[PDB]
């Protein structure tokens, strides 16, 4: 609904051993979604924002999305893009909480 944020991220796969997949994300507000291409209709894996226990930056431009379960590594282009998206997922957590 209204996808907010949308880019190409590189996403870590759990196969091997810090191996990155270039996937289409998108953050409506409800759910981070991504996508093989953004042309697919279908999306290759949902993360409802409910799920989302936290998010956090990493060492390089790199953010994790925790989970209960999993946690999702996603790899920017750069420190900026980084922090809009931490930003946007941790100011959507702390909203959902209250
Ligand atoms: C150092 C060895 C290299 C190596 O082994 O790298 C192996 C890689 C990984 O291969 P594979 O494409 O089968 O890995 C799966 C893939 O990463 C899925 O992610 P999506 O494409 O975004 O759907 C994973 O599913 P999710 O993340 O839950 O979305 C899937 O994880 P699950 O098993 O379903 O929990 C992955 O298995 O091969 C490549 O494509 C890369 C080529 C080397």
Same mark, same amino acid.
């Given at each position: %609904? @209204?996808?907010?944020?949308?880019?190409?991220?590189? +996403?870590?796969?759990?196969?091997?051993?810090?191996?990155? #997949? $270039?996937? /289409?994300?998108?953050?409506?507000?409800?759910?981070?979604?991504?996508?093989?291409?953004?042309?697919?209709?279908?999306?290759?894996?949902?993360?409802? %924002? @409910?799920?989302?226990?936290?998010?956090?930056?990493? +060492?390089?431009?790199?953010?994790?999305?925790?989970?209960? #379960? $999993?946690? /999702?590594?996603?790899?920017?282009?750069?420190?900026?893009?980084?922090?809009?998206?931490?930003?946007?997922?941790?100011?959507?957590?702390?909203?959902?909480?209250?």
């Amino acid at each position: %609904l @209204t996808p907010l944020l949308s880019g190409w991220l590189d +996403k870590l796969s759990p196969q091997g051993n810090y191996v990155f #997949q $270039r996937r /289409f994300v998108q953050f409506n507000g409800r759910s981070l979604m991504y996508f093989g291409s953004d042309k697919d209709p279908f999306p290759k894996g949902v993360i409802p %924002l @409910t799920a989302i226990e936290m998010t956090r930056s990493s +060492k390089d431009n790199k953010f994790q999305v925790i989970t209960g #379960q $999993r946690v /999702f590594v996603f790899r920017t282009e750069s420190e900026a893009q980084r922090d809009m998206w931490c930003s946007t997922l941790q100011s959507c957590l702390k909203e959902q909480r209250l």
